[PDB]
Amino acid sequence: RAAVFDLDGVLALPAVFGVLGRTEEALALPRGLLNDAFQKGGPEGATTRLMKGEITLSQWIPLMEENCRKCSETAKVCLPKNFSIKEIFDKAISARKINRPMLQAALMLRKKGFTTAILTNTWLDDRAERDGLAQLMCELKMHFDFLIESCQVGMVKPEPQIYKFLLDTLKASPSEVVFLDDIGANLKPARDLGMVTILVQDTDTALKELEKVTGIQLLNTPAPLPTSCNPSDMSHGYVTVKPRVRLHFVELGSGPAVCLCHGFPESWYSWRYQIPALAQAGYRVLAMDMKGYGESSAPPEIEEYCMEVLCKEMVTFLDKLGLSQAVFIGHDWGGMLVWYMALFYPERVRAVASLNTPFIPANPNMSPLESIKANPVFDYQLYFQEPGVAEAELEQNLSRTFKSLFRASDESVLSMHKVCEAGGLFVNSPEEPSLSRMVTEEEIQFYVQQFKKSGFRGPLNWYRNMERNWKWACKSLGRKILIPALMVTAEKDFVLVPQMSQHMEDWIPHLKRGHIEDCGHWTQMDKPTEVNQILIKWLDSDARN
Amino acid sequence: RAAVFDLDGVLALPAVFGVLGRTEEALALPRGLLNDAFQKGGPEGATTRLMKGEITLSQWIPLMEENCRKCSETAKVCLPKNFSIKEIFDKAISARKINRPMLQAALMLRKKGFTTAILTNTWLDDRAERDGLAQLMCELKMHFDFLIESCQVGMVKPEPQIYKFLLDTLKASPSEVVFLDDIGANLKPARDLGMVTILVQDTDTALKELEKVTGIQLLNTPAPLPTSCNPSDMSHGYVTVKPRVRLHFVELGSGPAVCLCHGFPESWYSWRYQIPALAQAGYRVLAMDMKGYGESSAPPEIEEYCMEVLCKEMVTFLDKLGLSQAVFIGHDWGGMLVWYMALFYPERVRAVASLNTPFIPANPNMSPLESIKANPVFDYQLYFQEPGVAEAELEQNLSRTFKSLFRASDESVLSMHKVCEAGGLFVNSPEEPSLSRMVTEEEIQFYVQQFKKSGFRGPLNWYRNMERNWKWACKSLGRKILIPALMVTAEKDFVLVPQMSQHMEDWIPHLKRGHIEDCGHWTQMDKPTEVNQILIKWLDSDARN
Ligand SMILES: O=C(NCc1ccc(Cl)cc1Cl)N1CCC(Oc2ncccn2)CC1
Numbered sequence A, B: 001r002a003a004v005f006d007l008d009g010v011l012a013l014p015a016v017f018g019v020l021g022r023t024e025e026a027l028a029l030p031r032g033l034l035n036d037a038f039q040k041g042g043p044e045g046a047t048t049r050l051m052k053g054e055i056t057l058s059q060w061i062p063l064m065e066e067n068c069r070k071c072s073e074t075a076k077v078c079l080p081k082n083f084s085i086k087e088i089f090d091k092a093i094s095a096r097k098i099n100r101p102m103l104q105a106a107l108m109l110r111k112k113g114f115t116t117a118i119l120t121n122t123w124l125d126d127r128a129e130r131d132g133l134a135q136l137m138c139e140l141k142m143h144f145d146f147l148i149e150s151c152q153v154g155m156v157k158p159e160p161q162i163y164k165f166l167l168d169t170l171k172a173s174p175s176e177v178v179f180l181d182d183i184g185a186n187l188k189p190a191r192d193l194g195m196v197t198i199l200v201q202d203t204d205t206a207l208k209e210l211e212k213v214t215g216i217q218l219l220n221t222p223a224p225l226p227t228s229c230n231p232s233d234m235s236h237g238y239v240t241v242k243p244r245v246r247l248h249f250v251e252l253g254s255g256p257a258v259c260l261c262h263g264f265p266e267s268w269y270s271w272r273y274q275i276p277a278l279a280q281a282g283y284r285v286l287a288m289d290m291k292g293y294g295e296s297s298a299p300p301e302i303e304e305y306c307m308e309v310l311c312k313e314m315v316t317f318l319d320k321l322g323l324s325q326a327v328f329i330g331h332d333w334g335g336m337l338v339w340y341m342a343l344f345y346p347e348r349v350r351a352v353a354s355l356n357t358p359f360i361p362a363n364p365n366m367s368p369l370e371s372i373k374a375n376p377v378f379d380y381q382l383y384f385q386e387p388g389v390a391e392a393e394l395e396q397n398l399s400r401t402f403k404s405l406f407r408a409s410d411e412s413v414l415s416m417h418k419v420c421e422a423g424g425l426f427v428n429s430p431e432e433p434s435l436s437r438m439v440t441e442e443e444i445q446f447y448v449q450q451f452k453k454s455g456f457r458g459p460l461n462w463y464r465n466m467e468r469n470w471k472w473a474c475k476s477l478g479r480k481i482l483i484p485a486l487m488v489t490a491e492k493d494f495v496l497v498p499q500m501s502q503h504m505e506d507w508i509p510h511l512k513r514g515h516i517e518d519c520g521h522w523t524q525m526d527k528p529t530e531v532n533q534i535l536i537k538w539l540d541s542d543a544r545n
């Protein structure tokens, strides 16, 4: 049981086939002139040779023209003065856009165990604007197990061989396979080989039919999550910033550089839902394992975690990567870091953005410890301070830990006030915590494996400079942030409440604002789709311009 | 003994200080109006506060205006209708360009054992166009051991503290240090602290003086090599393309993606001289460890090295990296690969380029082995064929191997014809080979270490598919390359002679051509500067447009 989708007319709706007609009307041409001239000679014909990979698209155009001279000639018509097949097809190809709901379906069947595949008759595109084809072929490609292109295999639909071929690459029986296609002709050979066939016109009936024979709802199915990340299928980067300090990250996409700075205690993976989005949106994403986390160096000394050096190391990270600047987006402790970045290295910062984390001026007259007791919900911060105590407690049950922390607003199971008195952090929580809606059991275990490397010393050391940070932070009390910034608040984040940012305007005049209702502190996994909305808008708006 | 250089007026010639005057003339302003208004209040003054990092540049402008209202007022003049300090400084900053010869000098002293450093009074730049500052600060930064900016340390020249500071960061005695600067005032405190001081105006006298007190020629010194690469200071990438196949590479720069495909038997490092250039030129460079080499998977089976799969894996490499297309530049076997890339994946190829390697149509009627005996200098290719024979011989003395192969035109020590009969490849060469001009002993040993990993099986397997490549290659006999391509020939490459490419025009109509006289087969290290010239021109010309 597996499912195969044609490109043109199935997953990519405006059909190149249909734009021909629209040109015929538009151009006052004899109905079918272009379509008939498109396939003159059958399998010996220019088009078939093209589908077989025998000639490039640019090699085909002239070959397509001549058909139209002849085809105009038999019907005894004229082809307009500036009539050009190049232009007609450019617009068309680039007029073709994904069919989000069909794609939706593939993703569901897939997620439901199905082996999926795009089986398309397609040329080798060597136009100048070919990028727009390659660009879309990537969007799609990824959400399928296979892509079979007529031009590489050397076979075209409806040659029964490409079907067997597909069958054998599928490793399935004809009876196990569903096959949707806009071209009846191409259904017949699959049909008569025994597989299911769906004729596609409206996507709605095509899907009704699909859910019917799969026994899996695809039609009007809930709002599906943004595309996530499989650590294996990723690109992983390593840069030494210091002799005993390597930073690790994940690279994806092309465009201006967007640098994602996670929080405590997370990993590059804490961005899984936005990493594909931003790439698609057209940026170059680089998700940090922040110092102390996972596959990045994790030095035991407290002082190697003050902001100054952490930023000193991001700069140096950009040094060794060929980057003048990058846009810094952070969350939790990362959102803080990003603020020092905009504050001490405007040069190197295209634009800054924080998730949850507010810009708080450092009080000259107030040792940040004093400012710790106030606001009672800041008790656990204390509990960390002492090297040893908390590390032990948090490294004791790894799985228990992340399960206990990673929870939606209401799934909470911790009261992070009275923490010190309580004698610990999970003092009054389970050891068997149930699994949140936000994470699968496999997305938890991942975090588990990252920390078996460096433990919690490092991450907890971020909380162990303050006297030092604060002091560094005072120097910048003269300054204002005048680069483009975005502040995004979460409703149900008890620790970092929207109202601490209330005063950020005194400091960042043209601060943009994003809010998110019904959202907790794990803004990335709790509200992936909205996080995406707010950040992509501001990126197009405020980054590259 | 170490050397310190100011930015403005020393390494970056048009001096911001001097453009003020040019504005005064230009604007018919009272000589010195701007300069005096630039430093009103001394150390309490806007400018000093700015140099100290107290305020951002954008915070300074208004503060700089008002000075000019007052300064115009005391001299009793008018400031023009649309008079703006913002615009005046924009142009200026972006009018400032590196001082190549001063830089030259730093690089020499450095290479000569000197500890070097930029000690500049500089602001924190938060303009929109700030990128142009960051961009240049990176060019330079890298070629020095240290950069000390007044705005981070919190100290300005000529405060004697920043000097001591510099001294203590240098870890040197005043007497050990040279210090060039355009501003006499800033020399005095260093001078009177005991270090050498040079007053810079013309760069030529400033350098005469430098070479004088260093005992090292800097003036009119030979044409220096392009900037190379220190593997440690690099960014190293890893992407799995297959279950048991990881590809490794080096990332640097930003812009369109340029993908560098080395040859046999080399490594990403075989591009050391062009990797910094292209980055600077403004592209995103990704130097491959090609399958079988160094830090990339090295599967023993022959067939995992045919072109088809090698390209299938580059595509897949671009998949997992967020790349629609990349420009492929190859050399030796890499130049070949790139040709299949342009031939089977135009979509995915922005532009193609080969170094040495020509585009040879596959003869339908001729088993490529037949076509092997012909052209006698293709004997060693035979010698490889047999899994075992050559691997053994080449893995025997690693160092001997690379020393023996990596040689300029005339440094040759091998006759790669009669190889089979001779009974080996280095049959009649030394074991103690002298070291070529092209490589230091440390650039050899590097190659040595890479191959202790995967050995020679893998690399030699590229030569072990031909019947297979050829067959794959026949399919494309219908096709023409119509994307932008560049073919670069080397004069003294006995194996890949310029004349094999003579016919490439029948295949690639608007093929661009680059030649290089007095050059061998190791085009990258033999002619780094020219390689750079040809490729950067064609990149601006033919890539991004
Ligand atoms: O405690 C954290 N992060 C960990 C954390 C936060 C919230 C929750 Cl629910 C769970 C966890 Cl583990 N921070 C406090 C200190 C940082 O700086 C800051 N700045 C201004 C106001 C408050 N904090 C923000 C991150």
Ligand SMILES: O=C(NCc1ccc(Cl)cc1Cl)N1CCC(Oc2ncccn2)CC1
Residues within 6 Å of the ligand: B263, B264, B265, B332, B333, B336, B357, B358, B360, B405, B493, B494, B495, B496, B500, B521
């Ligand atoms: O032998 C090599 N490279 C290794 C090599 C070349 C030259 C020298 Cl001096 C030393 C070494 Cl080790 N090639 C021959 C096969 C490849 O394809 C090809 N295509 C057309 C004509 C000739 N070759 C080019 C690379």
